[PDB]
Ligand binder design. Structure first.
Ligand SMILES: N[C@@H](CCC(=O)O)C(=O)O
Ligand SMILES: N[C@@H](CCC(=O)O)C(=O)O
Lengths: 261, 259
């Protein structure tokens, strides 16, 4: 029985090679999560097929219908057997899916144009001439909606109120918004992606110092999945061997295009 | 009549214009604290004269001799009526002079050459092949001297004992030492100046994220000065009016060469 792996196009976790138009199957994709998916399949011993999430979203729950979208949705409604993507382990998501122990750490961070007069999240709260927003349906927006910190709650109010909408449908759109906005838009995105983009051309982006919290990515499986335990202890057997850190160094910093390292 | 303002050459707070040799008086100087001095004098309503501290130091107290040097020294001994400079508000200085409320926040930070394998102050404490030092007579040196945190005390011991001299007499000397040291010297300086240098050519210096503490700059006046209240309410009306942030952005980022 073939295993259907649900994932999302997100640099550097899953990208499509240049020759991806003359290729088929799993040989079209490249990144941290494709290799991680391969090695996970080797340790567990199942053949798998890479699928991109249909709606292109990570996973949020409608307040009124209590329905789920994105990869979490595709797991709850039996559209995929396992999710191998930068999917943050959150309390709400744990209600409907199972998470392995974190295979990578991260935290919400700010991304600005190099040379911009911003130095903190509280600075963002005070000012108004620079806009800032969040991904459309991800751990970040959920964090700001349910946050009780005064600064974070204020930022949330501004974002929900500020129009022309400050939110974005894909992180790429956010980074592009920052780069084109001539330092008038700052993007709130997870630290890993911020660092990655920071170390790649045109080298005009900067990560502000300070993570707003500390979470991690986990391997998600449907509640009651026969594959849950195997992958859950598998990622630990890969952490002991240190291959996860070798992958991080492989895709983030071993080939940094900007300045120095 | 005229009030003598004591200050210090420290970019971008007080600098000398590109010409300045074709100018005289207060029109030779430029920076954050020159403008702040202008607005303070406007709100209070006094004509002032800008003077650079004679010994070129901020302010420390000899343990045995007591006595003060730098701008604080010039304030205690009636050599100047007010000090408008990046002068950190500390308890010891507050014992002998008066400080307005902070017009700018800051914290001790590390400055490295871009491409250096350092990520924290504790990393510096553990290793020994990379040197690190501080300004000679400022809030930073006193911070490391009177710190009881294990790492900070260890760094202090290293700096004071191991000396191919690691200290510097002016911030410029520190930044130059970092740039020339090929990533083998890291400079411990307040975060604000580190950010400024980070935003100026040749764009080869970097500020580590971890700040070692959190303090602020205040306008200093001698104990019992008639100008204390006036300047305090001036800086409060300028923080309320928001001009301080416009000045920070003006001198740090409005003319950033590294981006
Ligand atoms: N990895 C996050 C994406 C949200 C973000 O980048 O802020 C998630 O699982 O939803
Ligand atoms: N500005 C500091 C000195 C600079 C430093 O120690 O980094 C003071 O008021 O003493």
């Amino acid at each position: 029985k073939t295993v259907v792996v649900t994932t999302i196009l997100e640099s550097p976790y899953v990208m499509m090679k240049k020759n991806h138009e003359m290729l088929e199957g799993n040989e079209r994709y490249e990144g941290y999560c494709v290799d991680l998916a391969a090695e996970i399949a080797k340790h567990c011993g199942f053949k798998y097929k890479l699928t991109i999430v249909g709606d292109g979203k990570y996973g949020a729950r409608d307040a009124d219908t209590k329905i789920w979208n994105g990869m979490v949705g595709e797991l709850v409604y039996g559209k995929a057997d396992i999710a191998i993507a930068p999917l943050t382990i959150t309390l709400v998501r744990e209600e409907v899916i199972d998470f392995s122990k974190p295979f990578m750490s991260l935290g919400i961070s700010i991304m600005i144009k190099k040379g911009t007069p911003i130095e903190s999240a509280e600075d963002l709260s005070k000012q108004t001439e620079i806009a800032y927003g969040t991904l459309d349906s991800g751990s970040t927006k959920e964090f700001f909606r349910r946050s009780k910190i005064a600064v974070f709650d204020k930022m949330w109010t501004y974002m929900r109120s500020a129009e022309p909408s400050v939110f974005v449908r894909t992180t790429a759109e956010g980074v592009a918004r920052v780069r084109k906005s001539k330092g008038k838009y700052a993007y709130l995105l997870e630290s890993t992606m911020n660092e990655y983009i920071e170390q790649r051309k045109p080298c005009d982006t900067m990560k502000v110092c300070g993570n707003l919290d500390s979470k991690g990515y986990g391997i998600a499986t449907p509640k009651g999945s026969s594959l849950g335990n195997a992958v859950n202890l598998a990622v630990l057997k890969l952490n002991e061997q240190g291959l996860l850190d070798k992958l991080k160094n492989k895709w983030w910093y071993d080939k940094g295009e900007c300045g120095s390292g």
